[PDB]
Amino acid sequence: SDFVVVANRLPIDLESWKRSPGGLVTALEPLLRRRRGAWIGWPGIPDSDEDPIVLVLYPVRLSADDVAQYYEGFSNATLWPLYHDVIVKPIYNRQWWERYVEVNRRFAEATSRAAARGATVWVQDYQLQLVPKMLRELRPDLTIGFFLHIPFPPVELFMQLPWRTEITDGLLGADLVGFHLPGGAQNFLFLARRLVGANTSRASVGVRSKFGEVQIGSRTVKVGAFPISIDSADLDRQARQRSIRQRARQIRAELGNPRRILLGVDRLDYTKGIDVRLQAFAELLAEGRVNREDTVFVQLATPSRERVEAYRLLRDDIERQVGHINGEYGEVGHPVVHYLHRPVPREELIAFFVAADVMLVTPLRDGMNLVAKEYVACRSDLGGALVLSEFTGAAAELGQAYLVNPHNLDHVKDTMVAALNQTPEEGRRRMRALRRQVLAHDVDLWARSFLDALASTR
Amino acid sequence: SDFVVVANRLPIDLRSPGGLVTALEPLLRRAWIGWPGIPDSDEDPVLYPVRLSADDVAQYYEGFSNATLWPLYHDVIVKPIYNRQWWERYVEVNRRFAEATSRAAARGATVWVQDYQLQLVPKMLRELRPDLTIGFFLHIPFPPVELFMQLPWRTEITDGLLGADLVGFHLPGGAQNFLFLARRLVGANTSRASVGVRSKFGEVQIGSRTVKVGAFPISIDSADLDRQARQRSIRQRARQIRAELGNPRRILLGVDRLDYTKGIDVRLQAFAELLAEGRVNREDTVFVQLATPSRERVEAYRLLRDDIERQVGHINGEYGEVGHPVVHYLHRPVPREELIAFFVAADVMLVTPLRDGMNLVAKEYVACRSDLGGALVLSEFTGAAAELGQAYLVNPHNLDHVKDTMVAALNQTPEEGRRRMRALRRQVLAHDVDLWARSFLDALASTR
Amino acid sequence: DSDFVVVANRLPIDLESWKRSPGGLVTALEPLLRRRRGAWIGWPGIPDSDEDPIVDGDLVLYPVRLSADDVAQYYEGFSNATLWPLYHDVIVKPIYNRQWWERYVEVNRRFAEATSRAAARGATVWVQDYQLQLVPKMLRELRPDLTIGFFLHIPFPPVELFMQLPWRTEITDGLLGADLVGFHLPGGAQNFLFLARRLVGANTSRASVGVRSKFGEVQIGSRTVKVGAFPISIDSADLDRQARQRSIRQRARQIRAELGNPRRILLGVDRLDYTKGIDVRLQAFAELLAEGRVNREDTVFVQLATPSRERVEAYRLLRDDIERQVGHINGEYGEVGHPVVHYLHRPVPREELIAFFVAADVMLVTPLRDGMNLVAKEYVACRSDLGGALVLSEFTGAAAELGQAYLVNPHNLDHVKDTMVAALNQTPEEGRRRMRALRRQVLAHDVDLWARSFLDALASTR
Amino acid sequence: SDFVVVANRLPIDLSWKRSPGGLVTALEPLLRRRRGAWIGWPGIPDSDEVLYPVRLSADDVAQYYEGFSNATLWPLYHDVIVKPIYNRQWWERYVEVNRRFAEATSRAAARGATVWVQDYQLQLVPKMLRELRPDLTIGFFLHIPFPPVELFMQLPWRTEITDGLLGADLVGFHLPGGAQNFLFLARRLVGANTSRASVGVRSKFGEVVKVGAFPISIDSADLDRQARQRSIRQRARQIRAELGNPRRILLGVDRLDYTKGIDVRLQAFAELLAEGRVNREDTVFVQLATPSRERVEAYRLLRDDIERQVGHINGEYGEVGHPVVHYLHRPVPREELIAFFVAADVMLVTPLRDGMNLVAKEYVACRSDLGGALVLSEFTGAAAELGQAYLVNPHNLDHVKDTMVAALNQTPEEGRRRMRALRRQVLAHDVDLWARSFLDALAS
Ligand SMILES: Nc1ncnc2c1ncn2[C@@H]1O[C@H](COP(=O)(O)OP(=O)(O)O)[C@@H](O)[C@H]1O
Ligand SMILES: Nc1ncnc2c1ncn2[C@@H]1O[C@H](COP(=O)(O)OP(=O)(O)O)[C@@H](O)[C@H]1O
Ligand SMILES: Nc1ncnc2c1ncn2[C@@H]1O[C@H](COP(=O)(O)OP(=O)(O)O)[C@@H](O)[C@H]1O
Ligand SMILES: Nc1ncnc2c1ncn2[C@@H]1O[C@H](COP(=O)(O)OP(=O)(O)O)[C@@H](O)[C@H]1O
Ligand SMILES: O=P(O)(O)OC[C@H]1O[C@](O)(CO)[C@@H](O)[C@@H]1O
Ligand SMILES: O=P(O)(O)OC[C@H]1O[C@](O)(CO)[C@@H](O)[C@@H]1O
Ligand SMILES: O=P(O)(O)OC[C@H]1O[C@](O)(CO)[C@@H](O)[C@@H]1O
C-alpha cells in the first residue's frame, strides 16, 4: 500500500455488520471508498481476528482489557472529558495510560506491516496520538500526517494530564499536524514551545493557509487548520428524490399535522447539549410562549459508549426529562416530545431533516458538528431554520444560522421563538447563504487541502 | 349539630384528593371540621374551618403525618423520620381539631373522626366533652407491632385512639394488631378471640367504659357508578380514546396518586421486560398511566416521581416509534367522566400496590364494566384482594409471576373474563359504601 | 460416619494463613465442640478451596467448596442481600432475585450432600441459621434415618413482611423437615407456627410457647415437628476468670493511660453492620457534646468495628456514612493529639478485647434489631468488680434477660442521649446494684444451659 | 477621604474577629500603616453602619454572595473544578449590590481621590463609580485566577463584566497569564485596541487603561521575628510531645475549599501507608481547615468527603490513643498557627488551582532555622516565585507520593539548601514591595 489510513474505527461495525457511528465515518467513508488503498482499525468488538475483508481493511484485535482500559478508559474517560473543557471531571489512571501506550504501539506495527516504502500514512484522532512518533521510530521512510477531529483544550487545562509531555511528543512524530480550527493549532504551537522546548512560529495560523512550524532537531513539523465537512453534493441530491419528500409529508401526518416541528439528532453524549434544548423547550411550554397543541419536538439519540458511567448518568437524566415534559404538557395520544434511542437509517433521517421547521444543534463544545451541515444541504427548498451553538466549530462557517451561547438559557429560549417566527423572506435568505458555503466547502476541498500541505513537507 | 365528622381537610380544594374524599362525599350529601388545604385561612364556616400556619402544614401535615406515620404504617417502604418537633406540632394541631369539634357539637352528639392525622383527637375530645359519643376509623393499614414499636410516642398514639367508643379498620388483622397493643402496651383487659368482618367485634376496658373495636372494609357507591358508566357519551368517548391511540388491539390502564405505595414502578419494569422478551407486541399493545400529583413538598415523593419519569422516557425510547409511544404518561387529575371512559376502554387494569389499606380504584373498574369485559390484575397486599378473590392476584415482589399474570390477562378467553367479571361485580354491588356506613354506625350507636 | 455433626455456612476458621472466623455464632459454638466429639461442615471463607479435611487440634472439619459464583449469588446475594435485610424488619430494601434463589437452592443441596456422607446411621445433625434453611428437608429426603435439629440465630420476621418473599412457601417447607426448630425467643417461635397454619395448611398448636419449655408442635403427615425458644448465651464462667488475670487488668490500666487518662471511657464493639446502631450512638454522642451536656476534655468514645460482607453495596454505604461521622465529631470537638472518638476498623485479639471491656465505664449496645447479641453478655461477665454500666437497645433479644440494664429505644434519640448522660453519672451504689443483678443472670444462663436443653429437646423426638 | 478601599470583606468579622482568607492577611498590616478609608461588608446580614461597612439583606447574601459570587464566578475562574450555575436572578442581585458598594465609595470619596476596589465580588463597580464620580482615580486587583478565554465565554454576562472592569484606570493580577488572557478578551469581546506583547512582572505593561501583573506577598519580616519567639519555639516542642513525639510531622493549613486539594494529600498519604512506604508508628499528618461558605452545597459535599477520608485512614492505620491523621475544623489563633509552622517537617500545599497561596510563603518565613520542607502545587501563583520548593502536579498522584517520600527523608543539607533560597525570595518580595508597584502604575 502506497497510502494508509489509521483510525480506531472501521467504516463497518459487527453485531453481521453495520455502519459505524460518528462523523469521522460520515466523512472518511465516502472519500476513501473512492480511493483504493488501506485502512487499519478496530472491528468494534473484543477478541476478533486479523483477517482482511476486501479497498482493503485490516482489523486490529483488541482484548477485553484493551477495550475497557484504552478505549472506554484512557480514550473516553480521560482524553475526551478533558479535551472538551472538562465538561465531566476526567480520571487519571496509570494502568489506562500503560494500556493506551501498548494499543497505540500495536496500531503503529499494523501500519508498518501495511505501509510500503516511502508510503503516505494518515493517522486520525485522539485515541491514536502516540502513533506518529512510534511509526517514525520503526519506519523513517514514511510521510506521516495527523488530524485531530476533536478540539484541543486551552493550555491551562491540558497541563492537568500527568502524561502531557508524552502526548505532545507523540504528535510531533508526524510531518503535518492538523486541526479543525486555528484555535486548536495555536494552542498546539504554544504547548510545543512551553513543554518540549522547541522553536515555533509566532504569527497566527490560517484556514487552509498561513501554516505554522515547529523545529524538532533535524526535522521541521508543519501545523494547520482544516475545517472538515460533508459530501455536500450527493446529500443535496439524495434529498430531492420524490420518495423522501413524500416521506417527510407522511412524517408530519403521523404526528397529527403540527404547525411547527423541531428536531435534534445526536449520539447520546454529554458534549451535545441535548439536556439544554429540552430544558429550554420545557420552560417555553411553561411560559405559554409556544403552543402545546400544534408544536412538537423529536429527538433522535444514538447510543454511544454506554459502559462509561458518565454516559449512563446522562442517559438517566435525559429520559427523566422526556417523561416529565410529556407528563405535564402532552395529552393521551399526543406527546409534545418524541424520544427515540436508536440509530435511524440514512433515508429515514433525511426525511426528518426535510420535515423539520427548526433544527436544534446546541453542544456545549464540539470540534465541528456535521449534523448542522447535513441539514443545510438537505434544504434545497430553502425552508427550515438552524439554531446553532457558538461553541461548535461550525458556527465559524455558518454565521447565518441563529447562533446561541448554550449556557445562557434565556438566549436559547429567545432564539428558539424567533426561528419559529421567522418570515419566509428571512429564512430563505439565511438558508441560501448557508447552502452556498456548505456546497463550496465539502469534504473534497478538506481532503485536498490537508494532503497537498502534507505533500509539501517532503 | 347532632352529627359531626372530623377529617384533615374539607371536600373541596383551594373536589379533594384521596380515597377518603371519593367515598364520604356522596354519603354526606344524603358539621364538617377540616382544613381548607391552604395556609393561614379565614375562620368563617355546614362546614367548620381549621386554619394552619405555614409551620403547622410543614411540621404537622408534611412532616409527622406523611413522613413519619404514613411510611411506617405502610411497612416502612421509605425510612420514617422520628422528629420530636414534628410530634409537638402534631399534638398541638390535633388539639385545635378537638376544640373546634366541641364548638360545633351538641350535648350528646355523635362524632366521627377520620384517618391517621387525627389519632389524638378522640382522647382529647373525650376529656373536653365526656357527653359526646365518638367514633374513629383508620383508612390506611395498621402496621405489625414489631414495627409500630419503633415510634418514640407509641404509648400516646394508642392512648388517643382509646378515647373513642368504637375504633375501626378495613381488616380484621388490623383490628387484632390494635388489641395486642391494648393488652401489652396499655395493660388493659381485652378480648382474645379473632375479630370478624362487621361482626364478632372486640372490646377493651378503659375504666368504667368499654371500647368497641372492629373491621369495616370501605367501598364505593357501586350502583351509581354503574349507571353513569352506561351512558352514550361515556361509551362514545371510550371508542374515541382508543382511536386516538391508533386503534390498539390491547389497552392496559394504571390509575393512582403518585405515591410510593402504589407500585407504578413495578408495573413499568414488568412491562418493559415483557417488551424486551418479545412476549407482547410493541405495535398493537399500549399502556396508559394516569398519575395524580401528591405531596411533592415531601422529598421521598419527588425521588419517586423522578424515577418513574425516567422509566417512561426509557421504555418509549427503546420500543416506541415517532408518533406512537408504547407508554403514555399523564401527571394531572382527570375529570370524572373522562376517567370512567378510560375504565371502559381499558382491557387490563393494573393495580399493583406494595401496600394499600383498601384500594377503591379496583372496585371503580369492577363497577364500570357492565359489558362484563376487561380484566383486573391485583396486588394481594391490598385490603381489596380479600373481597375480590376472582381477580388475577399477584405478590408484587414476585416479578416473574407479575409478568406471567399480565400475559394471561391479555390473552384470556372472553368466557373466562366474563366469568371472573360476573363474580367480582356481584360482590362489589352487594357491598357498597352504604353497607359500610350503616355497619360501622350501627356499632358506634350500640355503646350508649 | 460420625454420630454427631453440626453444619453451618461458616467454619470456626477463615482463610485469608488462618484467622478466627467472625460472628457470635462462632463464639458460642466453638468452645463447645472442642469438648464433645463430632464433625462440622462449613465453608472455609474463600472460593475454589479443596475438599481435604483439617486438623483443628482435636476438632476436625469438613470444608465446603464454593465457586466464585456461589459466593456472589448464594452468600452475598440471597443470604445477605435478601434474607438478612428482610428478617431484620426491612432496615434495608431486600433484593428479590430468582437466579440468587436458584443458586441458594443448589448450595443448600451441596451442604446436605456433604452432611449425609459424614453422618452415621442414626446420627444426630444440628443445622445452623438462615443460610441453610432448605437443608433439613433435603437431608430428611436423603437420609430418613437421621435426627435433624435446626436453630435460627437471627430474628424471624412478622408475617406481614415474610410474605413479601416469592419463596416464602419453599423456605417454610425446608425448615419443617427437622425434628426440632429452635429460636432465641417465643415471639420468633410463635410467628413460625402462624406461617405453618396459614401457608402450608398444617395443624398447629395454638398456645403460647415458653422459654426452654412449653414447646409448640407442627403436624406433618405422620411426622411431628417440635418447636421451642432457646436464648443463646456465652461461656459465662470462663470469661469471668479470663478477666481476673493481672495481665488483663494492667492492659486495662495502660489502655486508659494511652488515652490520656480520661475520667470516662465509652465503648462499642460490633461487626460493621447496619443492624447495629453505631450511627445512632455516634449521633447521640455528637449532640451531647454540641449541647455541652458531656465534658469534651475528660470523656472519650472508642469504637471497635470488624469489617463484614464488604462486597455488598449496602455495607460499603454504611461504612462511608460512619467514617464521615468519625471525622466530623473529632474535627468539631477534638484537639490535636486528643480526639473525642477512637475508631478501629479491624478485628481485635481476644485478650485485648477483654481488657477493653474492663477499662470501659459505659458499654454502648444500640442495635436497631438483633436476634440476641452477645457483646452485652460478654461485657457483663467481665466486670467481676461490679463496675461499669450497660446501655442496651430493647430491640435486642438480650433485653428480655437483661432488664436491669439501661434500656433504650434507639429510634428515640432524645431518650438515648439522656440515658447516656445518666449512665456516665451513676452513683457507685447504683451501678453495682444493676451490675450485680445482670451478672446473676449471665452466670446462671450460659451457653452450656442453652445447648443442653435444645439438644435434650432434640433427643426427645426419638 | 482620598484613599478608599472597597472589598466585600472587612478586616473584622462579626464581637469583631479576624477575617478569613489571604486578601486580608497581606493588606491588613499593609494599610494599618497609612490611614485612609475602607468600604466593606461586616460578614453579617443587616448592619446599621477608619472603616465603612456595607449592609446586605438576607436576599443579597444568598443570591449575590452565596449565589453569583461563590457559585458562579469562583468555580468558573478556577478552571471549572465545580460546574458553575448560571442564574439570571443571582446576576440581577449582583448588579444591584455592586451599585450600593459604589455609592458608599462615593460619599467616602472626596474630589480627585484614589480608589482601590478588591476581588471578584465587585467587578462592576469600576465602571459604575466613574460614571458617578468621573474625578476619581480607580484601581482594581483580582485575587483569584483569571480564566482561559474558552472558559470565560461561558458566562452569559461576559460583556458586562469586562465593561465593569474597564471602568478603572489600572487592572492588576498576580500573574502575566491573567494579564494576557484579559487583553485578548478586551480586543475580542468589547472591540478595543489592545497591546500584543507578553506582559512582564511589575513591568512591560499592556494598554487598552493600564494592565499589569503584581504578585502579592505577605509581611515577610514581621512573621519571621514573630516566629523566633521563645514562646513559639516552646509550644512547637509542646506540640510534638502532645502527639507522642513523632519522627516526622506533615501539616496542611487552608480553608475548606475544593480548590485547595486537601483530598489529594489525604489520598496520597493513605496509599503510602497501604504500600508500606511511610511508617505508621512515627509519622503523623495534621490538617487544620477553617470552615468556608458552608451554606453553599458544593462545600458541604466536599466537607462530607474529606471527613470520610479522615475516618477511613485512622480506622485503617491508627491505633487506639494514636491516630495517623488529626483533623481540626476551626480557625486557629495566629500565635498557635506559627507554632505549627515551626513544628512541621513537611508543609503540604496541593491546590488544584490557586491564584497565589500565602500559606506557603508563611511557612517559608517562619523557618528561620532553615529546617522543614515545602511540597507545593504547580497550579499556584506562588510556584512562579518558589521554584526551589518540591513541586508537584497534583493530578499525578504517583508523583505526589514519590515527592512526599523524598521530602520526608531529605538530607538536612538538601533541606537547608532549598529553604535558604526560598527565604531569599520571600524576604525580598513582601507585601509592601507589591503595593508600591501597583500604585506607582496607578499613580502614573
Ligand atoms: N440518532 C441518529 N440516527 C442516525 N444517524 C445519526 C444519529 N445521530 C447522529 N447521526 C449521524 O452521526 C454522525 C455524527 O457526526 P457529527 O455531528 O460530526 O458528531 P460526532 O462525530 O461527535 O458523533 C452524523 O453524520 C449524524 O447524521
Ligand atoms: N389520575 C387520577 N385522575 C382522576 N382520579 C384519580 C386519579 N388517581 C386516583 N384517582 C381517584 O382517587 C381516589 C383514590 O382511590 P384509592 O384507591 O382509595 O387510593 P388513595 O386514597 O390512597 O388515593 C379514586 O377514586 C380514584 O378514582
Ligand atoms: N471489632 C471486634 N474485634 C474483636 N471481636 C469482635 C469485634 N466485634 C465483635 N466481636 C465479637 O463477635 C461476636 C459478635 O457476636 P454477636 O454480638 O452475637 O453479633 P453477630 O453474630 O451479628 O456479629 C462477639 O463475640 C464479639 O466479642
Ligand atoms: N485553619 C486556619 N487557622 C488559622 N489560619 C488559617 C487557617 N487556614 C488558613 N489560614 C490563614 O488564611 C489565610 C489564607 O491564605 P491564602 O493562601 O492566601 O488562601 P485564601 O485567600 O484563598 O484563603 C492565610 O494567612 C492562612 O494562614
Ligand atoms: O466512540 P465511537 O463509538 O467510536 O463513536 C464516536 C466517533 O466520534 C468521534 O469521537 C469523533 O471524534 C470518533 O473518533 C468516534 O469514532
Ligand atoms: O459469617 P459472616 O457472614 O461473616 O457474619 C458473621 C455471623 O453472623 C451471623 O449472621 C449470626 O447469625 C452468622 O450466621 C454469621 O456467621
Ligand atoms: O470572604 P470569604 O468568603 O471567606 O473568602 C475568602 C477570601 O478569598 C479571597 O479570594 C482571597 O483570594 C478573598 O477575595 C476572599 O475574602
DSSP D154-167: T-TTHHHHHHHHTT
Determine, for residues B397 and C161 on separate chains, whether the beta-carbon distance falls below 8 Å.
no
For residues B125 and B241, membership in a common domain is answered with no
Q: How far away, in angstroms, is C22 Cα from ligand 6 center?
A: 7
A9 assigned to a ligand binding site: yes
How far is C337 from chain D, CA to nearest CA, in Å? 5
List, chain by chain if needed, residues with CB within 6 Å of any ligand 7 atom: D 9, 20-23, 119, 143-144, 292-293, 355
CA distance B403 to D122: 62
CA distance C78 to C174: 16
C53/B contact by beta carbon, under 8 A: no
CATH number of residue C383's parent domain: 3.40.50.2000
The residue with cell 412491562 is B271
Q: How far away, in angstroms, is C229 Cα from ligand 3 center?
A: 22
CA distance D37 to D50: 6
Measured between beta carbons, the chain C residues lying within 8 angstroms of B397 are 96, 164-166
Contact assessment for residue B125 and residue B132, using Cβ atoms and an 8 Å cutoff: yes
Question: What backbone torsions phi and psi does residue C193 show, to the nearest 5 degrees?
Answer: -70, -25
The residue with cell 452565596 is D66
In three state form, how does the secondary structure of chain C look?
A: CEEEEEEEEECCEEECCEEECCCHHHHHHHHHHCCCCCEEEEECCCCCCCCCCEEECCEEEEECCCCHHHHHHHHHHHHHHHHHHHHCCCCCCCCCCHHHHHHHHHHHHHHHHHHHHHEEEEEEEEEECHHHCCHHHHHHHHCCCCEEEEECCCCCCCHHHHCCCCCHHHHHHHHCCCCEEEECCHHHHHHHHHHHHHCCCCCECCCCCCECCCCEEEEECCEEEEEEECCCCCCHHHHHHHHCCHHHHHHHHHHHHHCCCCCEEEEEEEECCCCCCHHHHHHHHHHHHHHCCCCCCCEEEEEEEECCCCCCHHHHHHHHHHHHHHHHHHHHHCECCECCEEEECCCCCHHHHHHHHHHCCEEEECCCCECCCCHHHHHHHHCCCCCCCEEEECCEHHHHCCCCCEEECCCCHHHHHHHHHHHHCCCHHHHHHHHHHHHHHHHHCCHHHHHHHHHHHHHCCC
Is the sign of the CA dihedral A281, A285, A289, A295 positive or negative? positive
Q: How far away, in angstroms, is C307 Cα from ligand 6 center?
A: 12
Measured between beta carbons, the chain B residues lying within 8 angstroms of A328 are 331-332
CA of C274: how far to CAs of C80, C282, C368, in Å?
12, 13, 8
For the stretch B358-376, what's the b/e string if a residue is b when 16 or more beta carbons lie within 10 angstroms of its beta carbon?
Answer: bbbbbbbbbbbbeeeebbb
For residues D255 and D316, membership in a common domain is answered with yes
CA distance C113 to B442: 62
The residue with cell 419463596 is C167
Is the sign of the CA dihedral B275, B277, B278, B280 positive or negative? negative
CA distance B55 to B52: 8
Q: DSSP character for A446?
A: H
CA distance B96 to B41: 14
Contact assessment for residue A308 and residue A72, using Cβ atoms and an 8 Å cutoff: yes
Is the sign of the CA dihedral C421, C424, C429, C432 positive or negative? positive
CA distance D136 to D442: 12
Q: Whose CA is nearest to atom 27 of ligand 4?
A: D359
CA distance B66 to B53: 17
For residues D276 and D200, membership in a common domain is answered with no
Radius of gyration of chain D (CA): 22
CA of B234: how far to CAs of A400, B118, B291, B424, C405, in Å?
53, 38, 21, 22, 68
For residues B206 and B249, membership in a common domain is answered with no
For residues C157 and C226, membership in a common domain is answered with yes
Burial class (CB within 10 angstroms; exposed 0-12, middle 13-18, buried 19+) of A195: middle
CA distance A24 to A267: 13
- Residue A401: other Cβ atoms inside 10 A: 27
For residues D296 and D231, membership in a common domain is answered with yes
- Residue A428: other Cβ atoms inside 10 A: 16
Q: Are strands A38-42 and A3-9 parallel, antiparallel or unpaired?
A: parallel
CA distance C36 to C30: 10
Contact assessment for residue A389 and residue A273, using Cβ atoms and an 8 Å cutoff: yes
C-alpha torsion angle, residues D370, D376, D378, D379 (rounded to 10): -130
Q: Are strands B348-351 and B250-257 parallel, antiparallel or unpaired?
A: parallel
Is the sign of the CA dihedral C153, C159, C162, C166 positive or negative? positive
CA distance C334 to C325: 13
C-alpha cell at D205: 505593561
| SS3 state of residue A285 | helix
Question: What backbone torsions phi and psi does residue C435 show, to the nearest 5 degrees?
Answer: -55, -40
B311/A contact by beta carbon, under 8 A: yes
Largest interatomic CA distance in chain B: 71
Strand partners, D5: D38, D116
Query: How far does Cα A284 stand from its chain's mean position?
Result: 29
C-alpha cell at A269: 453524549
CA distance C216 to A161: 70
Q: How far away, in angstroms, is D39 Cα from ligand 4 center?
A: 22
User: Which atom of ligand 6 lies closest to the CA of C128?
Assistant: 14
**Resolution of the model in angstroms:** 2.3
How far is B277 from chain A, CA to nearest CA, in Å? 18
Burial class (CB within 10 angstroms; exposed 0-12, middle 13-18, buried 19+) of B139: buried
- Residue C297: other Cβ atoms inside 10 A: 12
List, chain by chain if needed, residues with CB within 6 Å of any ligand 1 atom: A 21-23, 26, 265-267, 300-302, 343-344, 349, 368-371, 374
CA of D387: how far to CAs of B110, D374, D384, D392, D423, in Å?
88, 11, 6, 11, 12
Q: Breaks in chain A, named by the residue before each, with C–N above 2.5 Å?
A: 15, 54
Q: Tell me whether chains C and D touch (3+ CB pairs under 8 A).
A: yes
C-alpha cell at A229: 465537512
Q: How far away, in angstroms, is D47 Cα from ligand 7 center?
A: 20
Q: Taking Cα atoms as reference points, which of C386, C385, C403 lies closest to residue C394?
A: C403
Q: Taking Cα atoms as reference points, which of A66, A62, A96, A63 lies closest to residue A78?
A: A96
Burial class (CB within 10 angstroms; exposed 0-12, middle 13-18, buried 19+) of B15: exposed
CA distance C33 to C124: 14
Residues of C numbered 144-173 whose beta carbons fall under 8 angstroms of chain B's beta carbons: which are they? 157-161, 163-166
- Residue C378: other Cβ atoms inside 10 A: 22
DSSP A2-48: -EEEEEEE-SB------B--SHHHHHHHHHHTTS-SEEEEE-SSBS-
Q: Which residues contact B150 (CB under 8 A, 6 or more apart)?
A: B72, B80, B82, C409, C411
CA distance C66 to C325: 37
CA of A150: how far to CAs of A99, A123, A179, A265, in Å?
21, 14, 8, 18
Is the sign of the CA dihedral B232, B236, B239, B245 positive or negative? negative
Q: How many domains does chain D fold into? A: 2
Q: DSSP character for D112?
A: T
Q: Taking Cα atoms as reference points, which of A150, A62, A136 lies closest to residue A102?
A: A62
Question: Which ligand places an atom closest to the C-alpha of B257?
Answer: 2
Choosing from A228, A230, A304 the residue with most ligand 5 atoms within 8 A of its CB, the one to mutate for a pocket test is A304
Composition of chain D by helix, strand, coil, percent to 5? 45, 15, 35
| Chain C partners (3+ C-beta pairs within 8 A) | B, D
| SS3 state of residue A84 | coil
Question: What method did the depositors use to determine the structure?
Answer: X-ray
Contact assessment for residue A341 and residue B319, using Cβ atoms and an 8 Å cutoff: no
C24 assigned to a ligand binding site: yes
Q: How far away, in angstroms, is B353 Cα from ligand 1 center?
A: 42
B145, B151, B397: residue with CB nearest C166: B397
Written as one letter, the residue type at A88 is V
Q: Which of B78, B85, B86, B146 to mutate to test the interface with C (most CBs of C within 10 A)?
A: B146
Q: Whose CA is nearest to atom 12 of ligand 6?
A: C153
Q: Whose CA is nearest to atom 14 of ligand 2?
A: B19
Q: Which residues contact D377 (CB under 8 A, 6 or more apart)?
A: D261, D349, D350, D351, D352, D354, D357, D383, D391, D392, D393, D394
In three state form, how does the secondary structure of A377-418 look?
A: HHCCCCCCCEEEECCECHHHCCCCCEEECCCCHHHHHHHHHH
- Residue C179: other Cβ atoms inside 10 A: 23
CA distance A384 to A262: 10
Measured between beta carbons, the chain A residues lying within 8 angstroms of B251 are none
Determine, for residues C339 and D320 on separate chains, whether the beta-carbon distance falls below 8 Å.
no
Q: DSSP character for A193?
A: I
For residues B441 and B398, membership in a common domain is answered with no
The residue with cell 420518495 is A243
CA distance D251 to D341: 8
Contact assessment for residue D358 and residue D341, using Cβ atoms and an 8 Å cutoff: no
- Residue A42: other Cβ atoms inside 10 A: 23
Written as one letter, the residue type at D417 is R
Q: Taking Cα atoms as reference points, which of D136, D147, D3, D158 lies closest to residue D81?
A: D147
Measured between beta carbons, the chain A residues lying within 8 angstroms of B244 are 332-334
- Region of C214 (left: φ > 0; alpha: ψ -120 to 50; beta: rest) is left
Measured between beta carbons, the chain B residues lying within 8 angstroms of C161 are 75, 144
Name the residue range of residue B208's domain. Answer: 1-221+431-448
Strand partners, C126: C6, C149
Q: Quick one: which H or E segment has residue D339?
A: helix D334-343
CA distance C204 to C191: 12
Q: Which residues contact D47 (CB under 8 A, 6 or more apart)?
A: D14, D41, D53, D54, D55
For residues B177 and B256, membership in a common domain is answered with no
CA distance B223 to B229: 10
Q: Are strands C223-229 and C216-220 parallel, antiparallel or unpaired?
A: antiparallel
For residues A272 and A382, membership in a common domain is answered with yes
CA distance A362 to A272: 6
Helix axes C350-359, C375-382, angle to 10 degrees: 70
| SS3 state of residue D364 | helix
Written as one letter, the residue type at C183 is F
C-alpha torsion angle, residues D403, D405, D409, D410 (rounded to 10): -10
CA distance C87 to C157: 5
CA distance D255 to D378: 19
C-alpha cell at D140: 482594581
In three state form, how does the secondary structure of chain B look?
A: CCEEEEEEECCCCCCCCCCCHHHHHHHHCCCEEEECCCECCCCCCCEEECCECHHHHHHHHHHHHHHHHHHHHCCCCCCCCCCHHHHHHHHHHHHHHHHHHHHHCCCCCEEEEECHHHCCHHHHHHHHCCCCEEEEECCCCCCCHHHHCCCCCHHHHHHHHCCCCEEEECCHHHHHHHHHHHHHCCCCCECCCCCEECECCEEEECCCCEEEEEECCCCCCHHHHHHHCCCHHHHHHHHHHHHHCCCCCEEEEEEEECCCCCCHHHHHHHHHHHHHCCCCCCCCEEEEEEEECCCCCCHHHHHHHHHHHHHHHHHHHHHCECCECCEEEECCCCCHHHHHHHHHHCCEEEECCCCECCCCHHHHHHHHCCCCCCCEEEECCEHHHHCCCCCEEECCCCHHHHHHHHHHHHCCCHHHHHHHHHHHHHHHHHCCHHHHHHHHHHHHHHHC
Q: Are strands A402-404 and A386-389 parallel, antiparallel or unpaired?
A: parallel
For residues A288 and A212, membership in a common domain is answered with no
Written as one letter, the residue type at C159 is V
Strand partners, C228: C182
- Residue D249: other Cβ atoms inside 10 A: 21
Q: Taking Cα atoms as reference points, which of C8, C43, C6, C39 lies closest to residue C25?
A: C8
Q: Long-range contact list for B264-267, CB < 8 A, 24+ apart?
A: B264/B289, B264/B291, B264/B308, B264/B352, B265/B304, B265/B307, B265/B308, B265/B311, B266/B352, B266/B354, B266/B396, B266/B399, B266/B402, B267/B350, B267/B352, B267/B402
Helix axes C413-424, C278-291, angle to 10 degrees: 70
Q: Are strands D12-13 and D17-18 parallel, antiparallel or unpaired?
A: antiparallel
Determine, for residues A340 and B329 on separate chains, whether the beta-carbon distance falls below 8 Å.
no
Question: Which ligand places an atom closest to the C-alpha of B288?
Answer: 2
For residues C72 and C103, membership in a common domain is answered with yes
CA of D251: how far to CAs of A340, C211, C265, C432, D259, in Å?
54, 60, 29, 47, 17
Contact assessment for residue C336 and residue C296, using Cβ atoms and an 8 Å cutoff: no
Q: Taking Cα atoms as reference points, which of C79, C78, C49, C76 lies closest to residue C61?
A: C49
Q: How far away, in angstroms, is C152 Cα from ligand 6 center?
A: 11
A154, A161, A410: residue with CB nearest D148: A154
Q: Tell me whether chains B and D touch (3+ CB pairs under 8 A).
A: no
CA distance C305 to C299: 20
Q: Is C11 in the pocket of ligand 6 (CB under 6 A)?
A: no
For residues B36 and B143, membership in a common domain is answered with yes
CA distance A88 to C432: 61
C-alpha cell at C321: 456514612
CA distance A111 to A128: 12
CA distance B45 to B43: 7
C-alpha cell at B64: 409527622
CA distance C89 to C396: 13
Q: Which of C162, C407, C409 to mutate to test the interface with B (most CBs of B within 10 A)?
A: C409
